[PDB]
Amino acid sequence: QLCLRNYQEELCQVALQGKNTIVTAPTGSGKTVIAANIIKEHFESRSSEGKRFKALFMTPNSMILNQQAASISSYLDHVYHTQIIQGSDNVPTRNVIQSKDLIVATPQMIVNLCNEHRNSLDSRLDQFFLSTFTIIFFDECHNTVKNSPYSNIMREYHYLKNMGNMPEGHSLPQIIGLTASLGTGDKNDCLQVRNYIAGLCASMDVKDLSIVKDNLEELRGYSPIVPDKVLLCERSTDGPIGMFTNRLTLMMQEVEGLIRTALRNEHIGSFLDPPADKEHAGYQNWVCNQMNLVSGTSFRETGTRTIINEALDVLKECFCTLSYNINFHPEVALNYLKDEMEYRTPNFTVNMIRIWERYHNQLVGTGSAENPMISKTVQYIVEQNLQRADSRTIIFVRTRYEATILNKVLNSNEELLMLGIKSEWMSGLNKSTASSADISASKQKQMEKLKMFADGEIRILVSTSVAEEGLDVPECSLVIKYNYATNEIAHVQRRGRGRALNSECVLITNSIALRDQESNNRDKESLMSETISLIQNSPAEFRKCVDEESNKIWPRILREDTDKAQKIEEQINRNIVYKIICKKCEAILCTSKDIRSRNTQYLVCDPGFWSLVRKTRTGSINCRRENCGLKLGQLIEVNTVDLPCLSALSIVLLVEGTDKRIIVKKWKNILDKYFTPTEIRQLDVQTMRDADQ
RNA sequence: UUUUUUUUUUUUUUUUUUUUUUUUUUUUUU
RNA sequence: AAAAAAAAAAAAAAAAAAAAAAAAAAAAAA
Ligand SMILES: Nc1ncnc2c1ncn2[C@@H]1O[C@H](COP(=O)(O)OP(=O)(O)O)[C@@H](O)[C@H]1O
Ligand SMILES: [Mg+2]
Ligand SMILES: [Zn+2]
């Protein structure tokens, strides 16, 4: 058992009244202990009064699910049965919910429950009720905006409260809200922030706020504040870094001129001129927009489109390496450019090959240099190591590739290797980011990385925003934000991540925008503190407008059915065909009648698809057309035979007759706007014949 | 030889959150 | 003409979850 603290007991007293309350406590103050104590008290009261009891615990991140469940079980002395429900587990949910008094499950499963009965063909396996659980908990409730799963659970709770489907004597469940910070959002004055906070609380049917009143000293002592030092490094326009930047701008102008001649050959006078600045995101946005127009238009010459797409891809890569050279030393940017260019080489023309070889020779002759930010970070690391031998440093970066580059830079310095200091490349488990080719993000790998950091083998953690919440990150003695800026909640979580004694938070950047964002975040935090103080001072909130306006639940569904009918009427157009072709090159991949879907995977049963595909080796699908290098999808097997799987992001839909190009981002749009493929039959036969020989 | 359960890896699709940049519209001020 | 605020569209980056499928390794049964 764990002894309750004074502020924890004060927070628990507010929720002990049975009303819906939201608890706002700093990270690491023991929200899990408070939740477990509230659950235990509610269960004891229900047992004393002689009625059924049930508790539901929900967390946005599955990484912290096991730790939270273990802590809850330990606090409850393992007297009540607990079961963890995740996507991997195939155990039925309703049976374990009925047979156990404490259920911990992903909120999406709760959303699916009591809602899957709708739009289901006739039985319907009865209907589940949200009010089955006596007490529910909403960890990290600040994300309950727009159409979040928490918003869906709130809508189900409103269904149960308003509509008269209560079975026998079912009572309204009590929900406790726990979050680090409510979230300013985009409001400016205190009144708007207070109104937004009150509306968010009303969306969860919460009227009372659990805020510490007289135990602030204990909270400050147990959770000391961490100053947020701001450090800025000036940029150097001269030296090897300046020479590298000049060479890359020369490459910018050369590629722009080549694009100009390519457009002139097409006799096209509409394309937008590139921005003068080659380092801002405006150049990348313009490149992406030009690529979108090129995909959405038709060209007289087939090779011109391929050349333009190759130029746009090289421009994007060169912008990425410009950002890398701005953030770090030119060595990593040169290495990234070299590996990307050597990967894309077998699909290039002779002139571009010579241009790249000349530019690479010039960059090799440039030399090397060191960035002031890297030197400052290294000096801070050695200073922390001198202060204590158990120093732990966590570094936040923008992208996963940025994390890998930072880890390589830190591991390449002999000054840290003299004392035996290593680093890692901690990232997130998400695989849908368009940059997952170099990212593994395995669950076991992440657990192993956490274990080695906890054991002390790894000192520097180049971790992304994933580690801010839902991760069992141990105490860190130094938090560094390497050109990374996020919202107020993420900044607060980063500041609170330094649970080690005398933790220091220092921000290192070379851009005025980062400093402005940090100042804005500090101002937002101060405004939140002022609003919280004002709310505490005045107990008469007198806020009920959103609570009464929340009666619009059924009009929402009414308009939902109306515009669903309108979308169905719009979709009624059919019996037409599509000439699906490759995005980069005008090659007939297949026709609209050769695409089939088994469950949710879209496979093309084209006998001639093998002749126009490369079939590399992992397994991947690549265009066989020269100078294309486009990944049309992934190769998968269902009947022990590999079959092609097209991707919407690598194909362009063409309509027969008029030359109207169609761009598709997700398969849902083409599914519900253009056509629907038929169900799969024993069509792997004709595909397997032509797969071999 | 087949079936059931557990673990690891991989793939497709769908539903959300946060940050930055670009563009458009409206209002206010100089 | 310039600046600020609000809404909308596009692009980039990061994070979360769900559904299904495939491969491999173990335990049990036929
Ligand atoms: N009353 C208490 N007695 C002992 N340990 C506590 C107490 N309250 C909190 N802790 C410890 O402090 C930590 C606080 O982190 P926790 O509340 O679990 O996650 P979060 O970061 O969401 O607040 C817990 O891991 C817990 O072990
Ligand atoms: Mg928590
Ligand atoms: Zn192609």
As for chain A, the residues directly before each break of C–N over 2.5 Å are 122, 269, 617
Give me the resolution in angstroms, 1 decimal: 2.9
Which residues are CB-contacts of A407 (< 8 A; sequence separation ≥ 6)? A423, A424, A425, A460, A462
Report the SS3 class of residue A147. coil
Q: Which of A327, A450, A463 is nearest to A393 (CA)?
A: A463
Which residues are CB-contacts of A481 (< 8 A; sequence separation ≥ 6)? A395, A396, A494, A505, A506, A507, A508, A509
Is residue A82 within 8 A of residue A69, CB to CB? The reply is: yes
At A399, list the tokens: 């992208």
Tokens 């000192």 belong to: A459
Q: Which of A468, A504, A474, A470 is nearest to A487 (CA)?
A: A468
Atom of ligand 1 nearest to the CA of A68: 18
Which residues are CB-contacts of A34 (< 8 A; sequence separation ≥ 6)? A8, A11, A12, A23, A25, A178
Q: Order across the sheet with A208-210: list the strands.
A: A82-85, A102-105, A55-58, A135-139, A174-179, A21-24, A208-210
Ligand 1 pocket test, candidate residues A10, A32, A68, most atoms within 8 A of CB: A32
Which residues are CB-contacts of A433 (< 8 A; sequence separation ≥ 6)? A400, A439
Q: What is A404-466 written as a DSSP string?
A: HHHHHHHHT-HHHHHTT--EE----S---SS--SS----HHHHHHHHHHHHHTS--EEEE-GG
A124: exposed, middle or buried (Cβ count in 10 Å: 0-12, 13-18, 19+): exposed
Residue A656 φ/ψ, nearest 5 degrees? -70, 135
Q: Is A369 in the pocket of ligand 1 (CB under 6 A)?
A: no
Is residue A595 within 8 A of residue A602, CB to CB? The reply is: yes
Distance A430 CA to ligand 2 centre (A): 21
Tokens 């326009």 belong to: A237
At A289, list the tokens: 């927009």
Count of helices and strands (H, E) across chain A: 23, 22
Which residues are CB-contacts of A237 (< 8 A; sequence separation ≥ 6)? A245
Instruction: List residues, Cβ < 7 Å, touching strand C.
Output: A 60-63, 86-87, 106-109, 112, 149, 186, 188, 281, 284-285, 288-289, 292, 398-401, 427-430, 432-435, 441, 464-466, 470, 599-601, 636-638, 640, 665
Is residue A325 within 8 A of residue A248, CB to CB? The reply is: yes
Q: Quick check: A513 CB within 7 A of strand B?
A: yes
Residue A194 φ/ψ, nearest 5 degrees? -65, -40
| CA dist list (Å): A434 to A175, A308, A588 | 38, 21, 25
Q: At A42, which helix (H) or strand (E)?
A: helix A31-49
CA dist., res. A549 & res. A202, Å (int)? 10
Residue type, A588: I
Is residue A689 within 8 A of residue A605, CB to CB? The reply is: no
Q: Order across the sheet with A393-396: list the strands.
A: A228-232, A504-509, A478-482, A393-396, A460-463, A423-424
Nearest CA to ligand 1 atom 23: A28
CA A236 to chain centre: 34
CA dist., res. A583 & res. A599, Å (int)? 25
CATH 3.40.50.2300 fits A228-233+371-528, yes or no: no
Query: Could you state, in order of their start, the residue ranges of all structural domains in chain A?
Result: 6-222, 228-233+371-528, 239-366, 581-691
Report the SS3 class of residue A603. strand
Q: Is A31 in the pocket of ligand 1 (CB under 6 A)?
A: yes
At A382, list the tokens: 């050695």
Residue A663 φ/ψ, nearest 5 degrees? -105, 135
Same topology between domain A228-233+371-528 and domain A581-691: no
Beta pairing class for A228-232 and A504-509: parallel
Which residues are CB-contacts of A70 (< 8 A; sequence separation ≥ 6)? none
CA dist., res. A67 & res. A72, Å (int)? 9
Helical segments of A123-215, H only: 149-162, 190-203
Which residues are CB-contacts of A336 (< 8 A; sequence separation ≥ 6)? A320, A321, A324, A401, A405
CA dist., res. A82 & res. A102, Å (int)? 5
CA A68 to chain centre: 22
Cα A48–A49–A54 angle (5° rounding)?
A: 85
CA dist., res. A256 & res. A251, Å (int)? 8
| Ramachandran assignment for A261, one of left (phi > 0), alpha (psi -120 to 50 degrees), beta (any other) | alpha
Q: What is the gyration radius of the CA atoms in chain A, in angstroms?
A: 29
Report the SS3 class of residue A491. helix
Half-sphere exposure of residue A270, counting CA atoms within 13 Å on the CB side?
Answer: 3
At A585, list the tokens: 């090159």
Residue type, A201: C
Residues shown for chain A: 693
Number of CB atoms found within 10 A of residue A673's CB: 14
The sign of the CA dihedral A300, A585, A629, A323 is positive
Cα A190–A196–A201 angle (5° rounding)?
A: 125
Q: Which of A32, A33, A40 is nearest to A16 (CA)?
A: A40
Three-class SS of A82-110 = EEEECCCCCCCHHHHHHHCCEEEECHHHH
At A71, list the tokens: 């802590």
Which residues are CB-contacts of A28 (< 8 A; sequence separation ≥ 6)? A223, A496, A499
Distance A30 CA to ligand 2 centre (A): 8
Domain A581-691: CATH class, spelled out = mainly beta
Method by which this entry was solved: cryo-EM
Binning chain A into helix, strand and coil, the percentages to the nearest 5 are 45, 15, 40
Is residue A235 within 8 A of residue A328, CB to CB? The reply is: no
A91: exposed, middle or buried (Cβ count in 10 Å: 0-12, 13-18, 19+): exposed
CA dist., res. A354 & res. A363, Å (int)? 14
CA dist., res. A318 & res. A324, Å (int)? 10
For residue A444, give the nucleotide whose C1' atom is nearest its CA.
B8
Tokens 């929340």 belong to: A550
| Start-to-end Cα distance in chain A | 69
The distance (Å) linking the CA of A639 with the C1' of C17 is 29
Q: Is A70 in the pocket of ligand 1 (CB under 6 A)?
A: no
CA dist., res. A13 & res. A19, Å (int)? 11
| CA dist list (Å): A152 to A110, A112, A117, A158, A223 | 9, 9, 15, 10, 34
Is residue A137 within 8 A of residue A210, CB to CB? The reply is: no
Is residue A533 within 8 A of residue A216, CB to CB? The reply is: no
CA dist., res. A494 & res. A496, Å (int)? 5
* A21 beta partners: A176, A208
Is residue A219 within 8 A of residue A26, CB to CB? The reply is: yes
CATH homologous superfamily of domain A6-222?
A: P-loop containing nucleotide triphosphate hydrolases (3.40.50.300)
The DSSP secondary-structure symbol of A623 reads B
A383-386: long-range pairs with CB below 8 Å, 24+: A384/A477, A384/A478, A384/A504, A385/A419, A385/A421
For residue A671, give the nucleotide whose C1' atom is nearest its CA.
B13
* Nearest ligand (C-alpha, residue A33): 1
Residue A335 φ/ψ, nearest 5 degrees? -65, -45
